[PDB]
């Protein structure tokens, strides 16, 4: 149940262009994962947010998705 950053490399938080890493911070849905599960810090999380949103505008990352099972 380890938090994201815990299993992850050394990466640029301000890079909107890189999906490979950023996707990992999103949820099953398109939601942006809370700090509890992203293992980040205040400033960290706060930069990640704006970065993700940037990506989203570019269509690289989902605004939202659909849930499965249920």
């Amino acid at each position: 149940k380890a938090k994201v950053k815990a299993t992850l490399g050394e990466f640029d938080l301000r890079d909107y262009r890189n999906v490979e890493v950023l996707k990992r911070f999103l949820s099953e849905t398109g939601k942006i994962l809370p700090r509890r599960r992203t293992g980040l810090s205040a400033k960290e999380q706060r930069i990640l947010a704006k970065t993700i949103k940037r990506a989203r505008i570019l269509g690289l990352l989902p605004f939202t998705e659909k849930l499965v099972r249920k």
Partner: protein, 116 residues
């Protein structure tokens, strides 16, 4: 009369009623049902039993249309929302996947007084 084989199943659940629509893979409806479709009239429609009977009605109506493989879409929180799906398990239809698509806004619209 189309003999539609595999198709899509949508379940729209509210607290006043539960209704079901079954469609072809590109989404166009085949047959449907609801709590009012069967006997029930008033609040009785929002009950789970109504949901079961509804899902089943739609199911049979699909059987006659030559339906077998079905994917499920569920929209809304409501009583017997689950029971609907439970009925489609025993529908005699193979249920490939279940998905919750329930629409939620990013807060565009001021809701009704009842809702805030």
């Amino acid at each position: 009369k189309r003999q539609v084989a595999s198709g899509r199943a949508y379940i729209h659940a509210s607290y006043n009623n539960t209704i079901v629509t079954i469609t072809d893979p590109d989404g166009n409806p085949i047959t449907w049902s609801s709590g009012g479709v069967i006997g029930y009239k008033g609040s009785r429609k929002g009950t789970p039993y109504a949901a079961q009977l509804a899902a089943l009605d739609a199911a049979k109506k699909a059987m006659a249309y030559g339906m077998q493989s079905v994917d499920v879409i569920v929209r809304g929180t409501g009583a017997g929302r689950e029971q609907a799906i439970r009925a489609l398990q025993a529908s005699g239809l193979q249920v490939k996947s279940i998905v919750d698509d329930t629409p939620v806004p990013h807060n565009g619209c001021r809701p009704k007084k009842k809702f805030r």
